[PDB]
Design a protein around this ligand. Structure first.
Ligand SMILES: [Zn+2]
Ligand SMILES: [Zn+2]
Ligand SMILES: [Zn+2]
Lengths: 464, 88, 633
């Protein structure tokens, strides 16, 4: 009775106060109000709805505040998201006493405004969040820190698109393994152990396969050096996401290493060759003609281009093209980087490279050893869309395989049930669309996998 | 006119079977080129989805060719064992 | 039915990858929903055989199904499954070991019986013993940690054995093993029986006499964090050890700072604060690299001191703690941010529920602004945001503090606002700080800065970002009252600012599908301008006022419009509203029908004030309509 006279009659008056207590940080007031409203029956749904609305509004405001910066900066956005998530979690635990019905509200709210936000609208795709997460993870892994990994793992559960994130993480791990610049093995082991619980088993098996492949490369290299300033990695194309290297002619000084090792391979393995890759290769050269000795690192194409400067002063781009065998786009991309490096006009950036057009005696730097290998200006975007297309193709193939295996078991299945089985079987990975699932049935049908039953359409049967 | 020397070098290479990489065992056409099923007709909507499928045995096989071969016999004809998909 | 399970089992060894992924899925679905002993044994055997396969998808599906399988089964099946999983875990195959570990973890998670846990713990105790292999040791440690995290009530008579088996792992050459065993010990400390904690503490105390090994300190910190109420009785034997070890030359004070902070946060009762306060003060000062994170830890250690303890506020004020905190404001960003956070926490703790803390704080105020003056010239947005937050907090805790510093602080605010590289967050923080300063300061110390504060505010008003526009509108509304306060006399020719301030405001009056907050802020600013500077406006006063009528129809800006009308009606200045009275009063009468307490009160007050101020211009027509809504009120 008392609860009906001191709380019930004024519930509306309390409601307007709730928002007033959310704008300003007052944990004691929220706790007292929750304790008061707990005694009342069916009087908590409105509070949960208001809390969810406030959480969504605050998240949208935070994401919009850092607009036009989160697209290429996966650090600040992730930091803000984690800070907001932890703040809300602490507020719920302390004020609401970690109520069962309130933790779900925050979970659904996060799952709602993480996928869709200003970044998603600007990028015109919901896969930007996993991309930023993968980039941030790679940044942390590449050169006390376990707290961030746990935060990323717990917040990652709200991400619906997991295949894109897994593919990006695999690509980053492969890139880091190819170019040895990792921080420590303990961090990698901890990350693998943490991902074992979240990700499935195929991903872990592939990562272990890559690890053993690189180990075999390392011990083969050490055995080769023992048998005899030259290290080459031998990896498997099937278990590593790398494409075939384009046409390229080896220089003179590097020819010897290409021959002897090949012979060493002939006596070790038969029926298999090696596909040398140069886009990922690197080297180092030393010069002394300057006022001081310089020890600089570069890529294979860069050393090949420079190594043409013996017995010459200046060149034409075409002789370069016909002597180095490099495509015009890559040749121009390398040449503009070299010009920016002040190693080879009014202005170097954004100046046309005209096939008709030497090294300048300069490049005065305080550091004895200087690294010039840097990512290209546009290769990042090209890699982005090509990886996105590959992921889309893999998703389509996986959907086709799932449909085929579902229909194999059932001799004759309805069209409606078939789309529920496909959605529920792959829901853990992604949420395929219905316009997208339709095409695949047609392609399967076009390839004689299935037959719409003769009596009526929208019933499919499996015919061998 | 300058002296440019090299001290060390790092390279990356990939190993694969020659007999399968140079030409697919099922289809005698070039792997990069369209398959026989895709070459017979070009207006079909399935002509842009034929790609190279790899496996544990590091063998290259066309997607359509391997899919059709898996109907009757599931063991790979080269190593005589269970074929598995790794990438495309 | 029996035939269903029989055919499922027959099709499970099908030799087709897709016929062994459908049968397993069907079995999982059937087991999930709410089976003879022979069928149970057969399905368990088939699942165990299939757990090791040449495909990852089927292996993962079987591992997932292992969870629900134990949910409905007798005890012997679980015992044999655990036994076979443990035996397989000892195999040299990495894949099989990982599969067994994942299955055991899933089984442990599925569980909330006792015999199974005892056997598992015994197997882990036997396996964790010193062995050449490390992978099995790490897997066993992970399984034990997961079990302790999940279950910590049973196995009372097994804690000594676990502690004895885990102790040798502390001196393992691998730092990962040391961290894992420290975490496992911390988790197990919660489960424990009570007699073991004393033995562990004594062993750690006697082992503290060691060479340069930070594992013992890390374990001590972990156990203190996991349980502080059970270690408060042994601080006299731990504090001296760390105090003496702090004199070492190697950079290892980080652990001492971390454990001191943990003790301060968790264990409130103690009287050793001054003993370590001087040590922390001297540690934060020295600098000579790996010397920045030690400074960061030293700075963060004072956070607990300034937050938890409150009765010791005056001794903090009299000591050199705030002096050093303010002095160390020209260092790298990582430590500067933590110093700012610590002093913000101190200021927050200053506010309570010979000389009072407020009086002492004011005496040091002149030493803060100067220290922040140079910070206003830094190009880092983080430093500017921290300075703005500090100024806002200082103004909020006690007004009237920054009275003789406006001339030296306004230029910094203008420079920060005019900077193009400033982000939206920095501009928002600067505007909020300016608004707080204006709302908590005398108007008499802002007249000279009007010429330097009106142009930037007007410029900020024209911003595509809506929050910045709202902040600029709020600043303009505050400045309208500050420049011409009607409560006290003033003498300042503000006429030159009448046009631009209006121009930036009237332009925002026309919403045209804009954010609701922007509309409300614009309406409030227009109402305040009309109420205050109503006489200055010429022929643009009536027409714009008509727009208010358009705001009385939509419910989005009804309360704001009513409040603005009420505020305008009550003011010393005489504002002509008659043209909107005959058409305005009836509309208000329509707000008394809908059930809205706040709206009803607002409209009643507006009508009352309008009638009181404007009684000569009235008509019985609208009066009759207004009177019709009284009987039901
Ligand atoms: Zn084809
Ligand atoms: Zn083929
Ligand atoms: Zn094969």
């Amino acid at each position: 009775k008392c609860e009906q006279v001191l709380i019930e009659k004024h519930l509306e008056i309390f409601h307007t106060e709730f928002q007033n207590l959310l704008d300003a940080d007052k944990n004691e007031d929220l706790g007292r109000m929750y304790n008061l409203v707990s005694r009342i029956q069916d009087g908590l749904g409105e509070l949960k709805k208001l809390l969810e609305t406030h959480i969504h509004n605050q998240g949208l405001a935070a994401i919009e505040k850092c607009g036009e910066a989160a697209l290429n900066d996966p650090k600040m956005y992730v930091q803000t998201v984690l800070d907001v998530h932890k703040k809300y979690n602490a507020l719920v635990m302390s004020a609401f006493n970690n109520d069962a019905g309130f933790v779900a509200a925050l979970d659904k709210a996060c799952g709602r405004f993480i996928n869709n936000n200003a970044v998603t609208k600007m990028a015109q795709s919901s896969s930007k969040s996993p991309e930023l997460l993968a980039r941030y993870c790679d940044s942390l892994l590449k050169k006390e820190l376990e707290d961030t990994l746990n935060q990323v793992m717990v917040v990652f559960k709200y991400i619906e698109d997991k295949d894109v994130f897994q593919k990006f993480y695999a690509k980053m791990l492969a890139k880091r393994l190819v170019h040895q610049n990792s921080a420590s093995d303990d961090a990698e082991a901890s990350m693998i152990s943490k991902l074992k619980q979240a990700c499935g088993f195929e991903y872990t098996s592939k990562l272990q396969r890559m690890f053993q492949d690189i180990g075999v490369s390392k011990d083969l290299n050490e055995q080769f050096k023992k048998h005899l300033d030259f290290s080459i990695q031998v990896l498997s194309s099937g278990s590593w996401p790398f494409q075939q290297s384009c046409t390229f002619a080896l220089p003179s000084e590097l020819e010897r290493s290409y021959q002897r090792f090949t012979a060493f391979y002939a006596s070790r393995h038969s029926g298999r060759k090696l596909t040398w890759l140069y886009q990922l290769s690197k080297g180092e050269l030393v010069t002394n003609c300057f006022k001081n000795r310089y020890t600089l690192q570069a890529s294979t194409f860069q050393m090949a281009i420079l190594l043409q400067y013996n017995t010459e002063d200046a060149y034409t781009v075409q002789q370069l093209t016909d002597s180095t065998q490099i495509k015009m786009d890559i040749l121009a991309q390398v040449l503009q980087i070299l010009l920016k490096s002040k190693l080879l006009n009014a202005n170097v950036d954004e100046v046309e490279l005209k096939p008709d057009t030497k090294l300048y005696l300069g490049y005065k730097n305080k550091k004895l050893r200087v690294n010039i290998n840097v990512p290209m200006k546009t290769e990042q975007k090209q890699e982005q869309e090509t990886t996105h297309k590959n992921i889309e193709e893999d998703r389509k193939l996986l959907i086709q395989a799932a449909i085929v295996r579902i229909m194999k078991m059932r001799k004759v299945l309805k069209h409606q049930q078939l789309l529920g089985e496909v959605l529920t079987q792959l829901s853990s990975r992604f949420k395929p669309r219905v316009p997208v699932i339709k095409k695949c049935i047609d392609i399967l049908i076009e390839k004689e996998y299935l037959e719409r039953v003769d009596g009526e359409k929208d019933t499919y049967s499996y015919l061998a | 006119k300058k002296r440019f020397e090299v001290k060390k070098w790092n390279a990356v290479a990939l190993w694969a079977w020659d007999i399968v990489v140079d030409n697919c065992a099922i289809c005698r056409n070039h792997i990069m080129d369209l398959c026989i099923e895709c070459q017979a007709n070009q207006a079909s909507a399935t002509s842009e989805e034929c790609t190279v499928a790899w496996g544990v045995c590091n063998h290259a096989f066309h997607f359509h060719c391997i899919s059709r071969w898996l109907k009757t016999r599931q063991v790979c004809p080269l190593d005589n064992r269970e074929w598995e998909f790794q990438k495309y | 039915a029996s035939y269903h399970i029989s055919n499922l089992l027959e099709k499970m060894t099908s030799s087709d990858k897709d016929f062994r992924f459908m049968a397993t899925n069907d079995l999982m679905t059937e087991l999930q929903k709410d089976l003879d002993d022979d069928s149970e044994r057969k399905v368990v055997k088939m699942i165990l055989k299939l757990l090791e396969d040449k495909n990852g998808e089927v292996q993962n599906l079987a591992v997932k199904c292992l969870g629900p399988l134990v949910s409905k089964v007798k005890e012997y099946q679980v015992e044999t499954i655990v036994d076979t999983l443990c035996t397989n875990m000892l195999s040299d195959k990495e894949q099989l070991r990982d599969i067994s570990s994942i299955g055991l973890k899933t089984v442990i998670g599925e569980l909330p019986a006792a015999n199974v846990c005892k056997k598992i713990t015994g197997r882990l105790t036997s396996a964790i013993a010193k062995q050449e292999d490390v992978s099995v040791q790490l897997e066993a440690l992970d399984i034990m940690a997961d079990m302790l995290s999940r279950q910590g009530g049973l196995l009372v008579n097994f804690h000594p054995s676990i502690l004895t088996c885990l102790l040798p792992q502390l001196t393992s050459p691998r730092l990962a093993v040391r961290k894992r065993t420290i975490i496992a010990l911390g988790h197990l400390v919660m489960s424990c029986f009570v007699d073991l904690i004393e033995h562990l503490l004594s062993e750690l105390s006697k082992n503290d006499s060691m060479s340069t090994t930070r594992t013992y300190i890390q374990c001590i910190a972990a156990i203190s964090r996991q349980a502080g109420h059970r270690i408060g009785e042994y601080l006299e034997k731990i504090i001296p050890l760390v105090v003496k070890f702090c004199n070492v030359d190697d950079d290892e004070l980080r652990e001492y700072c971390i454990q001191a902070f943990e003790s301060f946060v968790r264990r409130c009762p103690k009287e050793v604060y001054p003993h370590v306060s001087t040590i922390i003060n001297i540690c934060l000062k020295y600098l000579t690299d790996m010397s920045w994170k030690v400074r960061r830890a030293a700075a963060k250690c004072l956070d607990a001191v300034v937050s938890t303890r409150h009765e010791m506020l005056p001794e903090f004020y009299k000591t050199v703690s705030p002096a050093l905190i303010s002095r160390f404001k020209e260092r790298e960003e990582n430590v500067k941010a933590d110093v700012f956070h610590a002093y913000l926490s101190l200021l927050k703790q200053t506010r309570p529920v010979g000389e009072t803390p407020l009086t002492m704080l004011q005496s040091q105020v002149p030493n803060i602004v100067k220290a922040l003056h140079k910070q206003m010239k830094e190009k880092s947005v983080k430093t500017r945001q921290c300075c703005f937050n500090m100024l806002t907090e200082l103004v909020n805790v006690l007004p009237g503090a920054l009275t003789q510093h406006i001339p030296v602080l306004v230029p910094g605010i203008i420079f920060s606002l005019n900077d193009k590289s400033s982000s939206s967050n920095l501009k928002i923080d600067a505007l909020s700080c300016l608004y707080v300063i204006l709302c908590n300061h005398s108007p008499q110390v802002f007249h000279p800065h009007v010429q330097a504060l009106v142009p930037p505010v007007v410029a900020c008003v024209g911003d595509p970002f809506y929050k910045i526009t709202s902040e600029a509108l709020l600043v303009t509304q505050q400045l309208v009252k500050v420049i011409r306060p009607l409560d006290q006399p003033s003498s300042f020719d503000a006429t030159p600012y009448i046009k631009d301030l209006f121009t930036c405001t009237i332009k925002r009056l026309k919403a045209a599908d804009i954010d609701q907050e922007v509309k409300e802020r614009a309406i409030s600013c227009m109402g305040q301008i009309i109420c205050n500077l109503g006489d200055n406006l010429g022929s643009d006063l009536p027409n714009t006022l008509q727009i208010f009528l358009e705001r009385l129809k939509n419910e989005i800006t009804r309360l704001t419009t009513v409040k603005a009308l009420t505020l305008i009606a009550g003011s010393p200045l005489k504002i002509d509203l008659r043209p909107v009275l005959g058409e305005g009063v009836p509309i208000l009468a329509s707000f008394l029908r809908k059930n809205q307490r706040a709206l009803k009160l607002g409209t009643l007050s507006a009508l009352d004030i309008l009638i009181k101020n404007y009684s000569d211009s009235l008509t019985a027509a609208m009066i009759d309509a207004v009177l019709d809504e009284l009987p039901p009120l």
